[PDB]
Amino acid sequence: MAEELVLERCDLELETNGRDHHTADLCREKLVVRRGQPFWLTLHFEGRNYEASVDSLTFSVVTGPAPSQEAGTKARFPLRDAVEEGDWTATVVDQQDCTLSLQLTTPANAPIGLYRLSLEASTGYQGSSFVLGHFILLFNAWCPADAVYLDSEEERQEYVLTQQGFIYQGSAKFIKNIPWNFGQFEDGILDICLILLDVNPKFLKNAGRDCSRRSSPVYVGRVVSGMVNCNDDQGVLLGRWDNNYGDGVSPMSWIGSVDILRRWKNHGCQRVKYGQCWVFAAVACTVLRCLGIPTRVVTNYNSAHDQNSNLLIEYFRNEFGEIQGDKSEMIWNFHCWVESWMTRPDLQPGYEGWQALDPTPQEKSEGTYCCGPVPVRAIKEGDLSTKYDAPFVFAEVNADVVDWIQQDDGSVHKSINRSLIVGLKISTKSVGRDEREDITHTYKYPEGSSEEREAFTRANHLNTGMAMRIRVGQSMNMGSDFDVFAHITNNTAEEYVCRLLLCARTVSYNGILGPECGTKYLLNLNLEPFSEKSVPLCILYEKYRDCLTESNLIKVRALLVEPVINSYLLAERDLYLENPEIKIRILGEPKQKRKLVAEVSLQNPLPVALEGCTFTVEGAGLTEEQKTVEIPDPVEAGEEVKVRMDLLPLHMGLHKLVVNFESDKLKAVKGFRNVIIGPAL
Ligand SMILES: Nc1nc2c(ncn2[C@@H]2O[C@H](COP(=O)(O)OP(=O)(O)OP(=O)(O)O)[C@@H](O)[C@H]2O)c(=O)[nH]1
């Protein structure tokens, strides 16, 4: 006669399992593990240890609201000597005293999510059942059987574990790297991501089906990308582009994904006020990285966006080169999306790798929606039949622009524009370093190459001796007066008298032109034979301050007209006005669970004073909460603003401290500092 087995306590070995499963930061009060990999379990009994002869143990796991084995959401498996032939297995590793050391294995295609683990202990016809605990199962980039497997440890670290990174903005001529705190492993973020999955429309429709289809990185990526902005009602972010963000946080102000997700969850999942394309991409990247899908934020300069996948874009301009069309959509200065790493069994073989996910809703036949995961290689090959919006992503980097100047007869003359090529300087943060990696080659083959022609035919694409370009003498700062030049080259014997029209206007990052901040018109301009000419245009801070966006972008337009042959030359350039540098000083010795002081300062570059000055500091591993300091007194024209923020780093290793500066006339100024936290000792 055998006494019933009595479970004192079940230990889920958070420390060891977190270290093995690369989820150590995630393992706070719950257990977090990655699928396709075994994890330790320890059972403590009072009185007697488990008897293989007299005791029978079966484990059960459930994840959905409607768990099913068929759907893959529920599994029951028995204790065994060696690993058995089954997706879910439990095997004895060691037995000592009253403790049983087990290893539990999950299939590499198990659906991700929160699971309840139950044990049915049957002893001599008397059956009892316990709930051992809960655990969250995530995608495993380390597991070769997993669809998201990455062979390189460096890439796994960068695309899954690294909580800070860069978003590339500015201009193609002047690329800017904005620090961002993804903070995927910050407190509560994993639960918020699970809520984001649980409140998505497909879950509302079926729930059991949605939880079952969470086994797929494609499905989860699509759901998350839609949830960021596209989903009405339960969307994470609300997008605004008119430069009026007073009632919310301006899109440029954000320094991390964490605050956005926290505001969204804390307010009953109402859309957090004001984000733009890079904000959508950054939040999506945070969610995917938290879920274990390797993801990176990507920036494309001169992006042909919201053109309904049109590969030939035509603009009709007046005598000054101004684009007349009220219908037409401008070429974005830059557009951001994400790339996620996965196999694609739903497609023909050979399309595993980076998949482009654009969480910014785009106009399409059948409505406005984000563009689902499409293999980047398919876009490169021109294989637009490939599933999930290959035509839109392809148009993004390969569209052609034709510029027309309208005649007095009502006819249009095609101008020569060599300044503009769409799909420029596609950039992403490099692996394990702060340098920028150019990934344009992944999207497109070299121009005028055999492969390019090959791809264009598969994509059914295949579309006076004077030159002009816009020149910047040197870097120009926000708040100052500077000159730009129209540089004309006449490499011909002819002498020309031409028309030069120069217009400088403030512009948003998505191409919305504001009023002109500088103009010069020269009706009779002599261009000597075999010579060059520089015509200056003066841009004044007073002229651009009122309508300048937080992107600090100004567009320069030059139209050169040669009347005799009636030839039109067009040159356009986007200028980025440099913000003042934020000086960061780290005071004390950076050690875990020890006080650290960050001194942040900047010098006012404006001729006028600054009011409402605020410093905001954020950083996963450096501070648990965002920190804000307001400077009560105004900062006059030449003075410096300096404040000290107290930080309590809770994690060892390298972390990036992200800083934002806000003021009435100087907004969204960014700074960052790499801080390595040593052992507490
Ligand atoms: N702040 C700022 N600096 C820039 C910008 N464009 C270029 N610069 C910097 O100013 C200098 C100008 O370099 P380029 O613009 O590439 O060259 P350019 O003066 O236009 O003349 P070309 O080389 O003939 O085209 C370099 O030091 C650039 O880093 C811009 O938009 N903003």
Residue numbers in the entry: 1 to 463, 471 to 688
What do the study's own words say?
Transglutaminase 2 (TG2) is a multi-functional protein that possesses various biological activities, including protein cross-linking activity, GTPase activity, protein disulfide isomerase activity, kinase activity, and scaffold activity. Human TG2 is 687 amino acids in length, consisting of four domains, an N-terminal β-sandwich domain, catalytic domain, and two C-terminal β-barrel domains, and is the most ubiquitous isoform of the TG family. When it is secreted into the extracellular environment, TG2 functions as a cross-linking enzyme in the matrix. This protein transamidase activity of TG2 is positively regulated by calcium and negatively regulated by GTP. Structural studies showed that TG2 undergoes an extraordinarily large conformational change upon activation; closed inactive form and opened active form.
Human exon sequencing data in the various sequence databases, including NCBI, Ensembl, and ESP, showed a valine residue at position 224 of TG2, supporting the idea that the G224V form, rather than the G224 form, is the natural TG2 variant. The 2.5 Å crystal structure of TG2 (G224V) was solved and refined to an Rwork of 23.6% and an Rfree of 25.6%. There were three monomers in the asymmetric unit, chain A, chain B, and chain C. All three chains were identical and contained GTP, which is similar to that of the recently solved GTP-bound form of TG2 (G224). The root mean square deviations (RMSD) between the TG2 (G224) and TG2 (G224V) variants was 0.51 Å, indicating that replacement of G224 with valine did not have any effect on the overall structure of TG2. The G224 site on the structure was carefully analyzed and we found that the amino acid residue at site 224 is a critical residue for the formation of hydrophobic clusters with neighboring hydrophobic residues, including V287 and L288, which are located on active site cysteine (C277)-containing ɑ-helix in the catalytic core. The active site cysteine (C277)-containing ɑ-helix, which is stabilized by the formation of a hydrophobic cluster with neighboring V224, was shifted to the opposite direction by 16°, especially the active site cysteine region. Moreover, TG2 (G224V) was approximately 4.4-fold more sensitive to Ca2+ than TG2 (G224), with Ca2+ EC50 values of 0.211±0.038 mM and 0.929±0.06 mM, respectively. Stability analysis of the two forms showed that TG2 gains stability by mutating glycine to valine at position 224. Based on these results, we conclude that hydrophobic patch formation, via the newly introduced G224V, may lead to fixation between G224-containing α-helix, which is connected to the Ca2+-binding site loop, and active site cysteine (C277)-containing α-helix.
